[PDB]
Design a protein around this nucleic acid. Structure first.
Lengths: 133, 57, 387
RNA sequence: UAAUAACCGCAACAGGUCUCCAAGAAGCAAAAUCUUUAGUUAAAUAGAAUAACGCAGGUAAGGGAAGUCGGCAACAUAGCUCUGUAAGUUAGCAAGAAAGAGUAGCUCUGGUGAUUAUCGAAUCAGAACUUUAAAGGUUAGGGG
RNA sequence: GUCAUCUAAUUAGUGACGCGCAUGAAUGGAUCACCGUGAUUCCCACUGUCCCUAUCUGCAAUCUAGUGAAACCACAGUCAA
RNA sequence: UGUCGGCUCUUCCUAUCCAUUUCAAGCAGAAUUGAAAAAAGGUAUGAUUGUUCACCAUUUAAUAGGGAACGUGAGCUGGGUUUAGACCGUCGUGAGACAGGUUAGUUUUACCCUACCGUUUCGGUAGAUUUUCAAAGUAUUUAGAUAGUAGCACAACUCAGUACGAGAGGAACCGUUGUGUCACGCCACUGGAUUAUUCAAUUAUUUGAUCAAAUAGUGUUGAGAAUCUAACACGUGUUGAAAUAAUGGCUGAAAGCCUCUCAAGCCAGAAUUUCGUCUAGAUGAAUACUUUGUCUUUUUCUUGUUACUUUAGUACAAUUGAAAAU
RNA sequence: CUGUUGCUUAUAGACGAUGGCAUCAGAAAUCGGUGUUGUAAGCUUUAGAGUUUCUUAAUCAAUACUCUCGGGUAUUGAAUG
């Protein structure tokens, strides 16, 4: 579902990390279980950065979304990361939006800003993104 | 780029950017200014700030 | 019993044993393969590392998603004042490797080169090359020298120039020069010696050896650390907090039946003053003549490559210098042995042109703001110390 | 002498051994911390360098028990005042449940008495102004 | 053990069923309010437990001047078959 | 001879899970299945259980199987088992028994030799006499017998909705661009530690009050240069030549034909082998100066070496030793 | 020639070792650059809520104005002279 490549973004989100769900699909928070495309190493915890697809679970939300495994995409993170043009930036919170393998967004709205890395990687997120940072 | 708190001219490849939830982003020059910005300190009351040096003299 | 989970081994056995070197200068263990269909040229140089800055560089590569404003890269500054050639030596291919045949030296030798042949100069009589100089013009010596020149052209296959630096042009307290043998890769041995003889006592600039946007290899000695533990030396995993007798060690140092600790087990020891060769290093700015400054087409302010306050622990750079993309092995003031690439890189990033937009000459101490001390006084205006 | 050297422990042993007299600050406090009278500066040797591995005390980007037999160890709450407090119950409790707000400095105002205007006690409440917005130097409950 | 429930995932916990190898009534049966440096499970908060290690201080360790033991010791001390 | 498992770490086997090179299919494509070369590289995160084992939820190119005194307790832990307290169930008249369950139970010593890792000291390699030479001493520049060896994997674009196939579906070669990990570094940019008790503030005690400090074994807080550092910052390992294993072929007999050869002779073909590159490295070589010029030993001076000093003794230029290949 | 020794020597370092200089040796301040923190002490702005005390002068008063981009520190492993 993703289009194009992504540069190095220091993955600040670990396994069992709770992130907000800026999507409007009745889900409040998501805790990361795995990371799609992660290459395993001994004793290493899966890592997620901006624009990274993850497999998460909902421990708080509506009954049709709670206690189930979803497939979110990280749109912003509190970890400071550096762009290739020498820009160092970091958001105020960790957030994600629920998508699927094809990439089509489940919801229709996003609250707050969306990082550039997740916007260009997933075209459907960019259309619903209010502002792209 | 100009620092949000100190108002100093930010050199290239220096400083940090803070993106708030209200869709407003500020780029700072050092952790000295960023910490004072997060405490809601008034740059008009901080003597070494460029903003303070414009209001007076 | 097998190990429960398989993980890569810690450290590299390609560098064992890890013995610290004795001489600061690192002798290059090879040279680019000779081609006999080209004009003879020098294949190496010698410079002293001064420090590192960062340059915003405009990308000339195509089909890459890098930003148009320019990427940010680090660059090392290698001050390379001209070196003086003080002789040349021929080598012959025998059944035990290269065997030097002779070494024809120049008539006049600087005191810097003389210091290499003693350990207490202030007590020495300083009579190095005294007989070689005072008897240089005798008919017996001139005939002997012609024999040495003729011997190389007949029974030799490798020519190297014994070039040395000039300690008077650098902020280092060392007075004795550094001597490097630079091979002459080019035509037949007949025209190699002719090139070598023409170079006696003649200073060679770095621009004569290396070109522009040239990929080179750097050989030097890394920064010393002294005695170090297993965690830093090999990167092994720290033990749990509960562990008796300590945390930072390798728990099992071998099985029973071999009854001897293997050479492959990570052990404590000396990390530090090791010789390393790094390949495929790009040259950004050839700081000779016009390009000796720190100005660019985009940023036309006139400033020196030395940052405000000088390079930390080094001083002020005023001679020719090189801009090396990335990091090189060794701390400031370390001697660096540059050399042309043995395996030239054919990647699109290796052939890509370099166009510098900005060069950072701001102070390397603290959170500096200004580029030049003049513009610092401009923005800050008149202070009160100077009324 | 009556004990970190005179007592018992093989010793000038960080163990043990019954009592009397007892200042100031601060605080609810014979608490922690600092000082006065008195005592002492020596109580199994020092100097140089400032490697690894240790013993004792610490801090940390993003994540927050994913480590582990097990939140083991550490972190975290913590004083006082006002509001407010559940199921359950032997009807006494649970209960400091849980949860929320306030606290500094300077300048003032009022209340609580004795003797016929003066004399005296810290305690409570209130109001402007100011600042780095205030229990937290020490002491000081994690909760369900 | 089988059924619910707790979790993304439950040889764990809780609640049910009971021909229960081999429960059961002052060898006491059932029932817990309050209490417990008692045993078990789950939540919120917090954190170097961990991802993954970095760094600081004191005391040693290192070297030196003085002083100065002990366990142990058939003889000793490089490997492959 | 310290008796389970787990943690840490190294190495070995192939009866190969992946990547590389091949052959076969009831192999159109895609996905697969059977087999050969090949052990240089990689082979994960968690709920429950002391568990090995097991069973689940993921991720991955793959989440292969085993050994090393059932590797590894003067390496750790003490969860289990496996003393001494106590409870229950069954058995026994009773003391007591239970590969039945439950809870609580001290984990000692390396300063010795060797192995391994690093690090010093001393000793030293024989055929050579074109003085434009030869040897010894000191110092520099180089040399490389041997030993180790390092780079892998994935993804995106284009090829291409193309080949193939009725349709459904649906690749690959070259090229380009990134990511992950491992290895080597490095201090520019960003982050962390911070007794420069740096600068500032401030609680308590003591300096008659201000200034300026001290004490609270670093009082505390905010900012915090240097130095170190990042799994948190960033660079390099995209690198060339030949010969090969399995296999596919060329010419070609045996065996008038056929055949890749259990024949002679060739070619192409791997994450392979060797050069090339990197690290350590022995005997060494060249040049500079001090010497010496048939030779040695015992003393002896020096921190040590060489030349050097005394008494000797010994020899004194002149027929030896080469075809190569088959 | 080499070693000891000196620079309380470094690009090095457990100790040796290693690297540099040794009379044009070295070290030291001071000065300028370069950094860190945030405006020093003294007098003035009735800054200033208010209470006193003359009587409508003063005094005391958190904090704040000018001198002040001030003062202090800065190799100790910074860089000129």
């Amino acid at each position: 579902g993703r289009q194009g490549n992504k540069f190095r973004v220091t993955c600040g989100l670990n396994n069992a990390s709770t992130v907000n769900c800026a999507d409007n699909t009745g889900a409040k928070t998501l805790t990361i279980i795995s990371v799609k495309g992660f290459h395993g190493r001994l004793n290493r915890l899966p890592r997620a950065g901006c624009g990274d697809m993850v497999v998460a679970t909902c421990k708080k939300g509506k009954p049709e979304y709670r206690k189930k495994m979803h497939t979110a995409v990280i749109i912003r993170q509190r970890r400071t990361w550096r762009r290739k043009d020498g820009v160092t930036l970091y958001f105020e919170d960790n957030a994600a939006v629920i998508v699927n393998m094809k990439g089509e967004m489940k919801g229709s709205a996003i609250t707050g800003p969306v990082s550039k890395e997740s916007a260009d990687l997933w075209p459907k997120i960019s259309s619903n993104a209010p502002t792209i940072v | 780029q100009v620092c949000a708190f100190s108002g100093f001219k930010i050199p290239v490849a220096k400083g940090r950017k803070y993106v708030r939830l209200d869709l407003k982003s500020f780029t700072f020059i050092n952790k000295k200014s960023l910490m004072q910005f997060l405490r809601k300190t008034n740059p008009r009351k901080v003597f070494w700030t460029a903003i303070y040096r414009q209001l007076n003299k | 019993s097998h190990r429960k989970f398989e993980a890569p081994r810690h450290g590299s056995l390609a560098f064992h044993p890890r013995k610290r070197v004795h001489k600061v200068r690192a002798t290059v263990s090879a040279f680019p393969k000779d081609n006999a269909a080209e004009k003879p040229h020098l294949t190496g140089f010698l410079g002293f590392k001064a420090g590192m800055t960062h340059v915003i560089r405009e990308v000339k590569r195509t089909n890459t998603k890098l930003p148009k404003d320019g990427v940010l890269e680090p660059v090392t500054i290698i001050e390379t004042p001209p070196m003086v050639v003080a002789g040349f030596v021929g080598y012959k291919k025998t059944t035990t490797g290269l065997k030097p045949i002779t070494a024809v030296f120049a008539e006049h030798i600087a005191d810097e080169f003389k210091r290499r042949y003693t350990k207490k100069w202030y007590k020495n009589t300083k009579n190095q090359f005294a007989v070689h100089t005072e008897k240089y013009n005798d008919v017996k010596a001139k005939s002997k020298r012609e024999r040495q020149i003729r011997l190389i052209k007949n029974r030799c296959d490798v020519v190297r120039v014994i070039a040395h630096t000039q300690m008077a042009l650098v902020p280092l307290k060392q007075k004795k020069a550094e001597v490097m043998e630079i091979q002459i890769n080019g035509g037949s041995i007949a025209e190699k010696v002719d090139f070598a003889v023409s170079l006696l006592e003649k200073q060679i600039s770095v621009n004569s050896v290396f070109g522009t946007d040239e990929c080179i290899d750097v050989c030097s000695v890394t920064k010393g650390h002294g005695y170090n533990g297993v965690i830093k030396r090999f990167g092994v995993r720290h033990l749990p907090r509960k562990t008796h007798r300590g945390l930072r060690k390798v728990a099992c140092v071998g099985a029973w039946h071999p009854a001897r600790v293997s050479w492959t087990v990570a052990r404590a020891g000396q990390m530090g003053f090791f010789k390393r060769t790094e390949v495929n290093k790009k040259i950004y700015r050839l700081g000779c003549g016009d390009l000796k400054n720190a100005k660019t087409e985009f940023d036309i302010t006139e400033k020196g490559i030395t940052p405000m306050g000088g390079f930390p622990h080094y001083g002020v750079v005023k001679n020719d210098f090189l801009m090396i993309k990335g990091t090189v092995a060794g701390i400031r003031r370390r001697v660096i042995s540059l050399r042309k690439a043995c395996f030239p890189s054919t990647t699109r990033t290796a052939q890509e042109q370099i166009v510098l937009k900005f060069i950072d000459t701001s102070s390397k101490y603290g959170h500096s703001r200004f580029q030049t001390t003049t513009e610092k006084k401009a923005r800050m205006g008149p202070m009160k110390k100077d009324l």
